[PDB]
């Protein structure tokens, strides 16, 4: 219902998230996916790496600059999975893809917005315990992505700042909770509680 929906991609299964995002974009919702380096794929790391290497060997023989472009970054791997689920060669598909942004980490301005999750795509809710799974950052770094460390350092800095913000918010929440607990005995409090509030 929001004008823009920001999905924290951490702990999501790539294909189920891609299916959800594709339907939302086609239905007209603006979506920003952050932390694409923390997406999961079910199956062993060696298996998913083998699948990527098969993708890598696919190329146009007489001119490689024409063949499939193998993007290494996690955001681009997710974008590929999504474009496969959109009819991207039509004007409607292009307009749908114009409604999507995908990022590694959480850069500005989304680092101060609310992030949501997609429960039907969450690894902890979908995969059975004991099943091996792959992380997109490791897969990307093994296939040639070169910014894993930079993103990790930036995310550590963001987490430090976010922890400070949350400490201040926790203090203010405690103060407001006390101010409301001192008002639980009033006539307005009794009337509101009778009405359910």
């Amino acid at each position: 219902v929001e004008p823009v929906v920001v999905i924290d991609g951490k702990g999501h299964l790539v294909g189920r998230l891609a299916s959800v995002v594709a339907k939302q974009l086609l239905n007209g919702q603006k979506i920003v996916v952050v932390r694409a380096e923390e997406l999961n794929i079910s199956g062993e790391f060696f298996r998913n790496k083998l699948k990527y290497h098969d993708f890598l060997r696919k190329a146009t023989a007489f001119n490689k600059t024409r063949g499939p472009f193998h993007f290494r970054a996690p955001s681009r791997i997710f974008y590929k999975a999504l474009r496969g689920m959109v009819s991207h060669k039509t004007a409607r598909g292009k307009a749908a893809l114009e409604r999507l942004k995908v990022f590694e980490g959480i850069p500005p301005p989304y680092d101060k917005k609310k992030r949501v999750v997609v429960p039907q795509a969450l690894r902890v809710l979908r995969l059975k315990p004991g099943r091996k799974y792959t992380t997109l950052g490791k897969l990307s770094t093994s296939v040639g992505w070169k910014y894993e460390d930079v993103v990790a350092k930036l995310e550590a800095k963001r987490k430090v700042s976010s922890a400070e913000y949350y400490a201040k918010k926790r203090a203010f929440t405690k103060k407001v909770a006390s101010a409301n607990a001192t008002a639980a005995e009033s006539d307005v409090a009794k009337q509101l509680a009778a009405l359910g509030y």
Partner: protein
């Protein structure tokens, strides 16, 4: 489907100088009486060469479970056909009714031995009165004093596409 148990009593076709045929009775688990009667004719012919025209069904009743809400251990003897020969199987099913146990058995046969309703014949369903008479450990396991177990990793159903908090699998 949702199974019912039918008692089916049939006999030979009466003729001249032929009174009192052999009243063959059977207990058939089926979704409805039409299927129960077809199954009865099939099993009658398999038991002995009695065609449908050579016979007549004199009775068919629905048998309800006597104590439908009492938990009972059932031993089920069956035999089923495959590409190989017919096989005989013994199974133990803990349930509150014979129809529930029979439905469980049909689903288990489909899941394990790829067999179907037309391939399974239910020889006998009997409640095992004594605890000590059970054999299968997947049934004997639920018979211990003060049984307790948790349900780890609870997965909650979500109605909406987006959730505004990480979910907990606690229970």
């Amino acid at each position: 489907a949702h199974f019912k148990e039918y008692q089916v009593i049939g006999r030979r076709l009466p003729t001249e100088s032929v009174p009192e045929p052999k009243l063959f009775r059977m207990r058939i688990f089926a979704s409805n009486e039409v299927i129960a009667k077809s199954r009865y004719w099939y099993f009658l012919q398999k038991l002995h060469k009695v065609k449908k025209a050579s016979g007549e069904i004199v009775s068919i009743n629905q048998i309800n479970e006597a104590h439908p809400t009492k938990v009972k251990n059932f031993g089920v003897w069956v035999r089923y056909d495959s590409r190989s020969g017919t096989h005989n199987m013994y199974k133990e099913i803990r349930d509150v009714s014979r129809v529930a146990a029979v439905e469980t058995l049909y689903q288990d046969m489909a899941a394990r031995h790829r067999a179907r309703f037309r391939s399974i014949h239910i020889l006998k369903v009997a409640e095992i009165e004594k605890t000590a008479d059970v054999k299968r450990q997947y049934v004997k396991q639920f018979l211990t004093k003060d049984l307790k177990f948790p349900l780890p990793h609870r997965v909650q159903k979500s109605t909406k596409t987006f959730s505004y908090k990480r979910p907990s699998t606690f229970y």
